Design a protein around this ligand. Structure first.
Ligand SMILES: *[C@@H]1O[C@H](CO)[C@@H](O)[C@H](O)[C@H]1NC(C)=O
Ligand SMILES: *[C@@H]1O[C@H](CO)[C@@H](O)[C@H](O)[C@H]1NC(C)=O
Ligand SMILES: *[C@@H]1O[C@H](CO)[C@@H](O)[C@H](O)[C@H]1NC(C)=O
Ligand SMILES: *[C@@H]1O[C@H](CO)[C@@H](O)[C@H](O)[C@H]1NC(C)=O
Ligand SMILES: *[C@@H]1O[C@H](CO)[C@@H](O)[C@H](O)[C@H]1NC(C)=O
Ligand SMILES: *[C@@H]1O[C@H](CO)[C@@H](O)[C@H](O)[C@H]1NC(C)=O
Lengths: 273, 49, 49
């Protein structure tokens, strides 16, 4: 279960921490190229009576930072795990987002078997979900605990047709792990809206390890509204779980009179650009 | 002398909408024009003599 | 010490140069020959530390 789509003008953030207004700034950094293609991975739960395997948590290359977008009203997505081997021989991050906290632990966790999963996995009759996640086993030699405020909140969705698109970008430069984020309340029917909404800086950490793989700690205990298909290659579907890769591009940003970013032009897409 | 960045000029109350992660303000030619007070969360505008 | 100090270790063999401010603490036998370095120790298989 995987498809493709087009990311029109999404994935732009503030390069630095200096206020600017009514001016055009030319910058060069790791950005998401305009009109690039982004994959769709869908988490499908099949035959809740039975226990059919899902394979809903693929491992992705993480080549020079990644862009992430999710459109879910619930808190089904909970954290992302990074690392080069995800074994006991190497050190792996454990960014985990529970109800009101974020625990970041860089360590050499022995194993990450799987999230807890009920055999029925049915949420049409039951709704409560209490303390049913435990992924690791041991932690021998490590530091850098960062218990802090939750990164992603939950905006209220009312009257239907109102969902919040959550966008994140993670990068690693000279042993520093940078995370930017933005939660756009307005997407409506369009799967990936076309427009501009800059990402504000969120967190910078001194991790200092190599990262060549990552995946998600998706709580596969239950999941609704997850249609399935056998499509592959250049096809279409529905996933509500996006991902894309950054490249070292040069952009030209236009700053509004109020200090916000209104428009941007890529300097490597077309001859006219 | 705001947090180690010296200068010279008159300071006035400013009406620029900063952001929580933004402290300094610049312009063309890359010179400081607006500063955020360290002790109190206030925005000041610098004008030369 | 007069007898000798052995509590200080340093790595000599590894696949590639490490990026700035990055630390490697893995203790695995380096593949320094055509022989598959699956064993604990042997010729063409060096302890990096
Ligand atoms: C990228 O995605 C598009 C669909 O939007 C597809 O046609 C193309 O083959 C993909 N790969 C590229 C452009 O390398
Ligand atoms: C989230 O985790 C933190 C630390 O692990 C804990 O203190 C907090 O109580 C947790 N949240 C809830 C709602 O239990
Ligand atoms: C943790 O430290 C001990 C003692 O220094 C060492 O024996 C052990 O191998 C270390 N853990 C890992 C995963 O290397
Ligand atoms: C800047 O903010 C003011 C304050 O409400 C608003 O009236 C004005 O429309 C904003 N400017 C732009 C270009 O949106
Ligand atoms: C000390 O610094 C804090 C920073 O926010 C400020 O709120 C407070 O008023 C300062 N105290 C005095 C006595 O100036
Ligand atoms: C570990 O970090 C080094 C530092 O340059 C990098 O070359 C390597 O690709 C990373 N991953 C592995 C598996 O060695």
């Amino acid at each position: 279960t995987q498809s493709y789509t087009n990311s029109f003008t999404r994935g732009v953030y503030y390069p630095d921490k200096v206020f600017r207004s009514s001016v055009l700034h030319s910058t060069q950094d790791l950005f998401l190229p305009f009109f690039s293609n982004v994959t769709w991975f869908h988490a499908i739960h099949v035959s809740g009576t039975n226990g059919t395997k899902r394979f809903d948590n693929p491992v992705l290359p993480f080549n020079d930072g990644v862009y992430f977008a999710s459109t879910e009203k619930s808190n089904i997505i909970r954290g992302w795990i990074f690392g080069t081997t995800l074994d006991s021989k190497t050190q792996s991050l454990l960014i985990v987002n529970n109800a009101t906290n974020v625990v970041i632990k860089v360590c050499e966790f022995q194993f990450c078997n799987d999230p807890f999963l009920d055999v029925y996995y049915h949420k049409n009759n039951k709704s409560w979900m209490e303390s049913e996640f435990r992924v690791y086993s041991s932690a021998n030699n490590c530091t850098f605990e960062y218990v802090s405020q939750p990164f992603l909140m939950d905006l209220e969705g009312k009257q239907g047709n109102f969902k919040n698109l959550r966008e994140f970008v993670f990068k690693n430069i000279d042993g520093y792990f940078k995370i930017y984020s933005k939660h756009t309340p307005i997407n409506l029917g369009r799967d990936l809206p076309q427009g501009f909404s800059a990402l504000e800086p969120l967190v910078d950490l001194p991790i200092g390890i190599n990262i060549t793989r990552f995946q998600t700690l998706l709580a596969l205990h239950r999941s609704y509204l997850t249609p399935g298909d056998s499509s592959s290659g250049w096809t279409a579907g529905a996933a509500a779980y996006y991902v894309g890769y950054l490249q070292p591009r040069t952009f030209l940003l236009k700053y509004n009179e109020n200090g916000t970013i209104t428009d941007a032009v890529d300097c490597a897409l077309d001859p006219l650009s | 002398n705001f947090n180690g960045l010296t200068g010279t000029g008159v300071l006035t109350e400013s009406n620029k909408k900063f952001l929580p992660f933004q402290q300094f303000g610049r312009d063309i030619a890359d010179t400081t024009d607006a500063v955020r007070d360290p002790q109190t969360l206030e925005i000041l505008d610098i004008t030369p003599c | 010490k007069v007898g000798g100090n052995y509590n200080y270790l340093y790595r000599l063999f590894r696949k590639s140069n490490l990026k700035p401010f990055e630390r490697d603490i893995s203790t695995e036998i380096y593949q320094a020959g055509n022989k598959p370095c699956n064993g604990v120790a042997g010729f063409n298989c060096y302890f990096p530390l």
